[PDB]
Write a protein that binds this ligand. Sequence first.
Ligand SMILES: CN(C)c1ccc(C(=C2C=CC(=[N+](C)C)C=C2)c2ccccc2)cc1
Ligand SMILES: CN(C)c1ccc(C(=C2C=CC(=[N+](C)C)C=C2)c2ccccc2)cc1
Lengths: 173, 173
Amino acid sequence: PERRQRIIDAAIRVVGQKGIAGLSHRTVAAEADVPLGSTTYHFATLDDLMVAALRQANEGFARVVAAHPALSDPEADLSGELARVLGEWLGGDRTGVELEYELYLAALRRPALRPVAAEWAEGVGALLAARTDPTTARALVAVLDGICLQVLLTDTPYDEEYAREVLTRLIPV
Amino acid sequence: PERRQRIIDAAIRVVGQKGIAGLSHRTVAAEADVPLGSTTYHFATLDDLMVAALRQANEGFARVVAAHPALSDPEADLSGELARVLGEWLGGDRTGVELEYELYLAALRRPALRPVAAEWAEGVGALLAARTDPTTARALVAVLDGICLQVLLTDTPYDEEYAREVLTRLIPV
Ligand SMILES: CN(C)c1ccc(C(=C2C=CC(=[N+](C)C)C=C2)c2ccccc2)cc1
Ligand SMILES: CN(C)c1ccc(C(=C2C=CC(=[N+](C)C)C=C2)c2ccccc2)cc1
């Protein structure tokens, strides 16, 4: 896009290969192939750069969730919907997908990054709480996290059938 | 103990403050306050050092599990037992506890560290599969991971009552 985006994109490509540690304005400038000046002009702190990156990723996810209105439809299959939302991104692309999670975590173990790293759970959690109940909402958010790990931690494909199955055991009747 | 242990201990203290990245034979030698020679004599590669550290942590956990024979007792409360096992370490010490998880993860996003980083799930998983069934075993392992995150990702204390509650919803009848 116009260089600010180019920079955020490169920041991402750098972390997705050298980890947050190998992320500097030099690394980014090189990767985005832009003056060092540009990167600092747009992002004073590396944290500002990180935060921007996560916000982009958060919005990336908050987008697929909005593409599943059924999630808040009381007549829809909730677990089926949640398993689809997962499968929709954990499915396929086991390349850039593995990279997106391998930074969601990296982000999490960072003091000022963690709050934005789990924002996805805020939207989902708020939605499931209104749909079901607080305890069920938290339990659901918990297995979602549990399942992504299981998956993105082995040559283990997704398996919606399994996900919906365990998700369903959590929804009360 | 004798210096090999001193070194593993220091390796841990270093990662628990500078992350795997700030971990070198220099860092370790300094921290353990031992000749650089010693650290390389005992651990040729940093990966050998990391792996040793994780094995120590794995054995640390595999120890509390063995201290709960009830886990495999068909007449015992499984979810209650699992929630106790968790609460037993996630409870209190929200200092060194937070550090143990903030390296379990760090480990996980590392190609040759990940296999040893999830060994805990191998023992637990094998135990729950024999106790219940494959699908239930995996689902249980999944929420355990989910719950530790929820917890070790906010000023959020543990709450066994909650854990046992969601764990119980996963056990079939
Ligand atoms: C464990 N868990 C439920 C989740 C784990 C990670 C994600 C994320 C994400 C970002 C972009 C995506 N895209 C572009 C499809 C999809 C997911 C994500 C959100 C913030 C920072 C990094 C990654 C969402 C849910
Ligand atoms: C998400 N999950 C179920 C778990 C997450 C982490 C642990 C671990 C651990 C190490 C030492 C412990 N001690 C000394 C009590 C307790 C746990 C652990 C195992 C290997 C490497 C790092 C940490 C176990 C379960």
